[PDB]
Design a protein around this nucleic acid. Structure first.
Ligand code: SPS
Ligand code: CL
Ligand code: CL
Ligand code: CL
Ligand code: CL
Ligand code: CL
Ligand code: CL
Ligand code: K
Ligand code: MG
Ligand code: MG
Ligand code: MG
Ligand code: MG
Ligand code: MG
Ligand code: MG
Ligand code: MG
Ligand code: MG
Ligand code: MG
Ligand code: MG
Ligand code: MG
Ligand code: MG
Ligand code: MG
Ligand code: MG
Ligand code: MG
Ligand code: MG
Ligand code: MG
Ligand code: MG
Ligand code: MG
Ligand code: MG
Ligand code: MG
Ligand code: MG
Ligand code: MG
Ligand code: MG
Ligand code: MG
Ligand code: MG
Ligand code: NA
Ligand code: NA
Ligand code: NA
Ligand code: NA
Ligand code: NA
Ligand code: NA
Ligand code: NA
Ligand code: NA
Ligand code: NA
Ligand code: NA
Ligand code: NA
Ligand code: NA
Ligand code: NA
Ligand code: NA
Ligand code: NA
Ligand code: NA
Ligand code: NA
Ligand code: NA
Ligand code: NA
Ligand code: NA
Ligand code: SR
Ligand code: SR
Ligand code: SR
Ligand code: SR
Ligand code: SR
Ligand code: SR
Ligand code: SR
Ligand code: SR
Ligand code: SR
Ligand code: SR
Ligand code: SR
Ligand code: SR
Ligand code: SR
Ligand code: SR
Ligand code: SR
Ligand code: SR
Ligand code: SR
Ligand code: SR
Ligand code: SR
Ligand code: SR
Ligand code: SR
Ligand code: SR
Ligand code: SR
Ligand code: SR
Ligand code: SR
Ligand code: SR
Ligand code: SR
Lengths: 92, 95, 160, 186, 154
RNA sequence: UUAGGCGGCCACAGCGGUGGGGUUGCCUCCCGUACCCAUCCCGAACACGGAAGAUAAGCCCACCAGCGUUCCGGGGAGUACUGGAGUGCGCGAGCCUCUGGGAAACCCGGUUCGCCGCCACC
RNA sequence: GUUUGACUGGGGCGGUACGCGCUCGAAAAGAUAUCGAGCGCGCCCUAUGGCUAUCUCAGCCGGGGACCCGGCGAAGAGUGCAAGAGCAAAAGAUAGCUUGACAGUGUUCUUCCCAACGAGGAACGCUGACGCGAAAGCGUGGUCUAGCGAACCAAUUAGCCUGCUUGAUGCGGGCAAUUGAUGACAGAAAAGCUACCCUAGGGAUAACAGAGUCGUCACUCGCAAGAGCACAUAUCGACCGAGUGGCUUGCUACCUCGAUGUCGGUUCCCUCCAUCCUGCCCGUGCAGAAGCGGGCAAGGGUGAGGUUGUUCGCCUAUUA
RNA sequence: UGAGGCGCCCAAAAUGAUCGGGACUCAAAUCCACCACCGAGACCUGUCCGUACCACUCAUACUGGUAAUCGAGUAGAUUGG
RNA sequence: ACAGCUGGUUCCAAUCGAAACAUGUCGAAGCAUGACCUCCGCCGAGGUAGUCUGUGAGGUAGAGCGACCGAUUGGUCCUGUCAAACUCCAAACUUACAGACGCCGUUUGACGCGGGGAUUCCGGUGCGCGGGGUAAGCCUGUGUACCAGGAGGGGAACAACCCAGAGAUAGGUUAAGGUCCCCAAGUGUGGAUUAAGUGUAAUCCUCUGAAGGUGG
């Protein structure tokens, strides 16, 4: 489906309607220093490694929208529930 | 049933007799009831909103207050007490 | 296949063509016989074949009886005799057959039948006071090819 | 009409007098309605309330009984409409009515029209009615100015039965002046 | 006022039909109760119609049954004119019988057990598999038929 | 209500038809576009301003039943169906009796060409 | 070293009735099963959402299958997609404007009738901020019922809490929430063979047999079209209809799994009749002889051989 | 010529036939009525037991009272011996 | 060793008395949570298994369709037929609430509430209504009573068909069913039919008897 790059809506930060810009959330890189990262190294050794021997699951036929909404005046973003959309293309 | 949605098997109870077909009179949609009043519950096919679960059609409850314009009606489903949010459009005074 | 299999009314009415496909064509060639251009009121005698028990009659049976009855009326009154007979019932009930044991047993469609309540007129003839006995014979041969017992009732006919 | 299954509209629908969808939305306020009507020659204002066997009018005013206070002018114009609303409004306050919702029935919400004039009048009478100023004709028009200047482009008196030559908005003032006053027998 | 006598046991009888008999103070076979003729009671007897025998008895018959089977609300004190006279609003059984038949009072109202625990029918009854019109003993009876039964069960 | 406004019930009110009604009164048709307002083009409509004309529309009043609808009488029908009961009948599908309820179609004769509430008004 | 699921008229194969929605089944409150009947959903849409203004649709007729004018026309149109339901001065069409498909937090119902259970859903509120409208009011997505996903972990959004004597920096831990999937859909990370097999049990579930059924099979009867050169009925006999048996087969899972040893044959005994011979009859398209058809009748008889394990059947010479 | 009642033909199975048997024919069959009987632990009645409740009581020890509206029971819960 | 699988688990009595179903489950030979049984405590005045009446809900039976819809005849308006997934109509009946009467509760404390303990989640039969199947002592629903866990009387025998719900003991009268003998009671009365031993068989896997025919 189609969707406007910018449009007026409520900004929970300014607490009033203002223009926002919609952006698909880009994945941020991992640091490899989170607790889970250290548990994988502490608990992995000889033989099977329990949960750390499992491999990536499947995929749902369609994913939900994963967007950021940035307020055009205070520069802050807020998240919203997403909805299943086979495709999301912005207009302009 | 073959399915279990809210409108399963409601072909009859949610269908209008042909002559009652069409937008309903506003009078009964604006009616005011007092707490303690006995009201019969019956969905009006022509009115979309303010309905209760079809399974409760035919109940005679007791107005025990309101929420916004809708009314909170107390009924006893079997032996279980329940509170129903319903708009006047689907209610009628008893007796 | 034996009629014992379908003669009783032990199942829901099954007639909706919109939800049933593959329904075999009927074997009944005609429902109105004799001189169908003339009215029934134009006759002094009116005799019907009445069913005595409620039953289902398959189209293959309606055809055999009707045939074996009109045939006689034709042989005794001629290919143009001054008479007219009517088979007033049509086979609306669709019949199945489970032809794998009792698993997914709903049967495939195999035929059609007409439901007849006891006391009803299956056939009705209109003749002249002369051929009144030839029609009584046609019915005698007709009720011999259908399940129930029948009464050959003589409606308009006080010439005895 | 055609058969058993035929659906005949509610009486007031087939007579083309009541817009039920608008009615319902109106009744949802819980407030009395300032029912503004108008005929070719007259204008009528009524404060209607909901009732068991039908609506209930608590107060009202007609352009006819306007003369009853000193009006010799026509009764189908702007000055006429406003004063009628004010008269009905004043009587409204009498019976204890304090607020209303404009019910223009099947008339159009044209800016500066008479049903809106009836409204401004009823509001000046002290009644609390949800409105919008920039939809009300400007003061002067209400007075009757637009018709004065029209008579200005004379050649043949605008009015037949000489009520006056160059007509009068100043009269409107005298009548409004007489209504806003306390005394007056409502 | 109709006399009601249970003639068919509780085994296999519908529960709502059995509860109806109990509301009419009948808990055993051969037990009789006196019920006023009202719309409410009418629905009740019509419901237990197939397990009972009922009808309006003659004043005399009611007098015989009361004499022989009436009991106090409590205790084994025999009920006779003297008892009636000293415990009820009447002078003797007759005064009571009349007031009952005319529905001015009830046994319970006069300190008597609501039930007349009758004896099996001497000479037997007409059967509990057929109504009166078919030669049985079930359902509504004539005052003479009802008296015949009650007297046999005296 | 000698013609009006806002309605409740939402065809007993619909469809169709006949007759009657209006000088400064009422509703209308009607006359007219400087204004407020209006038409994807039209003062047609919407809106505004107005009285030369008119009761032909509409409307209101009185009425007609052919079609549609409501209710009612008589007939169909205590039929069809049915809650309770049965050591009643039938090879059987099924039927009957007693008790308590009880249609629909259709025909014939009536009823129905709205009823009611608030306000205003020779 | 383990896993290789569940359902199932036994199991396997087939299928998914394994998560959802609609009509019917369902017996006029509610609830209600089967490998029950018809059939759908795992999306799509920035408008195909929202409001306002103006407006009325299928279809038919008349006048100049595109367009223009008039008439009839309560809805048969349209409303994204199943089905059922809703809707006409609209919930449909057109035009314009707009982003409420918004943030926070609840009430109630549903999910799960009654009657406890999560996610998910719906109706209805309060608060905040907005859109449109003269205003009442409408907008918590699409008229209603399908379009859905736990914990752990990661990424993401804004502010704040916190990390072992202490301060600074790095890098971590946490409060709230969004997104990523488990369709075996209230969530394990997961293929088969065993006739070399083993244990626990089950007649809770199959094979043979018994029992029930009798569609199938065998046999009979009613009707008698038709032909039999003429001739229904010497004889053959379609259709359709009604039955009997329990010899075939199928169905069911009632009995038996702490066992009732398979088929065929053989040997030996009793029986049934729907009769092949023998006795006695009737008809004949009965000259005779002999055929053919039918009736009574179960005393007796009904044998030997070739292939094949065969039952069956085919074949040979005898035979009443 | 119409209708009704009972019966007859249709009607064949395997160790020994059957309405339980005997056996029954103006019935010991069938249908319509009727009369009198037999027959449960049901119902009525005497006495006793248990249990529940009541009065008195420290008592759950006696004594008295009430039970038409108490008296069957697998799994299981409760309690005295 | 473990098993969700088979077997067994020892004295007496008194009160009450099920569930063989719902939701979830690698779950269907198991559990948990509900329903239901029981025990204890709290509460303190009503309760509602029956019926009647009033105010409502409902589209099954039936019926009908020139009332929709889709089927389904023929003739030169008429004439012949239908519907589990049709309805212009429309029951009996089921059901919400209330009042009345009844019954019940206020020392036997009902209704309601909190907590302890379960058992149970293979069911079956009759009757009514079903859906599948030619059918079945079939499969799968639903309501109810029964068996299970229910004696005693009858039914030849015979879990659920009839009578009947039962402390002990005793007298009496009946119930279902029966009265020629076996075996308690009639070789009962008035009348009629049957000649087949029809029949002497309520119900039923169990008791057959059909279409067709009969100057008996
Ligand atoms: C006591 S069990 C006896 S057995 O079942 C006897 C029956 C005779 O019909 N034999 C069989 O069923 C044989 C079945 C066979 C099957 C299914 N498959 C085979 O490969 N061979 C068989 O013999
Ligand atoms: Cl996205
Ligand atoms: Cl609800
Ligand atoms: Cl107006
Ligand atoms: Cl003891
Ligand atoms: Cl009991
Ligand atoms: Cl004999
Ligand atoms: K075995
Ligand atoms: Mg339905
Ligand atoms: Mg006593
Ligand atoms: Mg008897
Ligand atoms: Mg005129
Ligand atoms: Mg029988
Ligand atoms: Mg291991
Ligand atoms: Mg399995
Ligand atoms: Mg239902
Ligand atoms: Mg995981
Ligand atoms: Mg992410
Ligand atoms: Mg699951
Ligand atoms: Mg689930
Ligand atoms: Mg083993
Ligand atoms: Mg077993
Ligand atoms: Mg078995
Ligand atoms: Mg052996
Ligand atoms: Mg023979
Ligand atoms: Mg010869
Ligand atoms: Mg022999
Ligand atoms: Mg013990
Ligand atoms: Mg004890
Ligand atoms: Mg029907
Ligand atoms: Mg048991
Ligand atoms: Mg006796
Ligand atoms: Mg003797
Ligand atoms: Mg015999
Ligand atoms: Na470690
Ligand atoms: Na409506
Ligand atoms: Na006029
Ligand atoms: Na698995
Ligand atoms: Na299969
Ligand atoms: Na939820
Ligand atoms: Na077999
Ligand atoms: Na057979
Ligand atoms: Na022989
Ligand atoms: Na051989
Ligand atoms: Na016990
Ligand atoms: Na183990
Ligand atoms: Na298990
Ligand atoms: Na079970
Ligand atoms: Na399970
Ligand atoms: Na009471
Ligand atoms: Na029926
Ligand atoms: Na029991
Ligand atoms: Na015995
Ligand atoms: Na015999
Ligand atoms: Sr380590
Ligand atoms: Sr490793
Ligand atoms: Sr996938
Ligand atoms: Sr069937
Ligand atoms: Sr026949
Ligand atoms: Sr004009
Ligand atoms: Sr038969
Ligand atoms: Sr009646
Ligand atoms: Sr393995
Ligand atoms: Sr198999
Ligand atoms: Sr909506
Ligand atoms: Sr393989
Ligand atoms: Sr091998
Ligand atoms: Sr054994
Ligand atoms: Sr023989
Ligand atoms: Sr011979
Ligand atoms: Sr063999
Ligand atoms: Sr062979
Ligand atoms: Sr006991
Ligand atoms: Sr006991
Ligand atoms: Sr008990
Ligand atoms: Sr029902
Ligand atoms: Sr005798
Ligand atoms: Sr005799
Ligand atoms: Sr048997
Ligand atoms: Sr039988
Ligand atoms: Sr016969």
């Amino acid at each position: 489906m189609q969707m406007p790059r910018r449009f007026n809506t409520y900004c929970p930060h300014c607490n009033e309607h203002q223009e926002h810009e919609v952006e698909k959330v880009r994945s941020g890189r991992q640091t490899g220093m989170k607790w889970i990262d250290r548990q994988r190294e502490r608990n992995s050794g000889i033989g099977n490694d329990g949960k750390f021997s499992k491999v990536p699951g499947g995929d749902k036929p369609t994913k939900k929208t994963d967007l950021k909404y940035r307020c055009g005046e205070c520069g802050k973003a807020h998240l919203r529930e997403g909805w299943r959309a086979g495709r999301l293309e912005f207009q302009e | 049933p073959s399915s279990n949605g809210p409108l399963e098997g409601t072909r009859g109870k949610l269908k209008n007799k042909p002559r009652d077909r069409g937008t309903s009179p506003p009078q009964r949609a604006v009616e005011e009831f007092d707490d303690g009043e006995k009201v019969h519950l019956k969905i009006d096919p022509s009115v979309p909103n303010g309905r209760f679960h079809p399974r409760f059609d035919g109940q005679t409850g007791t107005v025990e207050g309101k929420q916004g314009d809708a009314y909170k009606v107390d009924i006893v489903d079997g032996g279980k007490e329940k509170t129903i949010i319903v708009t006047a459009a689907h209610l009628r005074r008893q007796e | 296949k034996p009629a014992s299999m379908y003669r009783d009314i032990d199942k829901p009415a099954y007639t909706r063509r919109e939800y049933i496909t593959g329904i075999p064509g009927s074997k009944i060639a005609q429902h109105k016989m004799g001189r169908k251009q003339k009215d029934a009121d134009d006759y002094p005698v009116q005799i019907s074949l009445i069913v005595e028990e409620t039953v289902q009659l398959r189209h293959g049976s309606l055809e055999a009886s009707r045939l074996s009855a009109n045939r006689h009326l034709i042989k005794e009154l001629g290919e143009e005799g001054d008479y007219k007979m009517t088979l007033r019932k049509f086979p609306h009930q669709v019949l199945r057959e489970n032809k794998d044991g009792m698993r997914a047993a709903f049967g495939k469609i195999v035929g059609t039948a007409a439901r007849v309540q006891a006391g009803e007129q299956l056939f009705t003839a209109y003749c002249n006071v002369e051929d009144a006995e030839h029609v009584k014979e046609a019915f005698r041969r007709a009720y011999n090819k259908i399940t129930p017992s029948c009464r050959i009732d003589s409606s308009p006919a006080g010439n005895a | 009409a055609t058969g058993p299954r035929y659906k005949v509209p509610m009486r007031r629908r087939r007579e083309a007098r009541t817009d039920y969808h608008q009615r319902l939305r109106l009744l949802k306020s819980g407030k009395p309605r300032l029912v503004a009507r108008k005929s070719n020659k007259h204008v009528r204002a009524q404060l209607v309330t909901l009732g068991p066997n039908g609506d209930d009018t608590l107060a009202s005013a007609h352009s006819s009984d306007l003369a009853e206070y000193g009006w010799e002018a026509p009764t189908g114009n702007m000055p006429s409409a406003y004063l009628t609303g004010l008269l009905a409004g004043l009587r409204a306050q009498e019976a204890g009515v304090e607020e209303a919702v404009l019910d223009i029935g099947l008339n159009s919400p044209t800016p500066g029209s008479k049903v809106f004039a009836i409204q401004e009048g009823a509001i000046d009478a002290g009644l609390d009615i949800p409105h919008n100023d920039d939809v009300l004709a400007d003061w002067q028009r209400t007075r009757g100015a637009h018709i004065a200047e029209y008579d200005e482009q004379l050649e043949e008196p605008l009015y037949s039965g000489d009520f006056d030559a160059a007509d009068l908005p100043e009269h409107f003032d005298e009548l409004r002046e007489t209504l806003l006053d306390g005394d007056i027998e409502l | 006022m109709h006399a009601l006598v249970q003639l068919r046991g509780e085994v296999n009888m519908h529960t709502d039909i059995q509860d109806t008999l109990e509301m009419l103070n009948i808990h055993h076979v051969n037990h009789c109760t006196l019920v006023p003729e009202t719309d409410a009671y009418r629905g009740m007897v019509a419901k237990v119609n197939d397990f009972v025998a009922f009808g309006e008895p003659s004043q005399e018959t009611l007098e015989t049954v009361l004499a022989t089977r009436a009991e106090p609300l409590e205790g084994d004190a025999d009920v006779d004119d003297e008892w009636v006279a000293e415990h009820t609003d009447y002078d003797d059984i007759s005064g009571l019988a009349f007031a009952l038949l005319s529905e001015e009072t009830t046994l319970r109202e006069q300190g008597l057990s609501p039930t007349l625990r009758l004896h099996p029918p001497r000479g037997g009854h007409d059967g509990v598999k057929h109504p009166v019109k078919e030669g049985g003993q079930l359902g509504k009876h004539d005052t003479e038929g009802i008296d015949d039964l009650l007297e046999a069960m005296r």
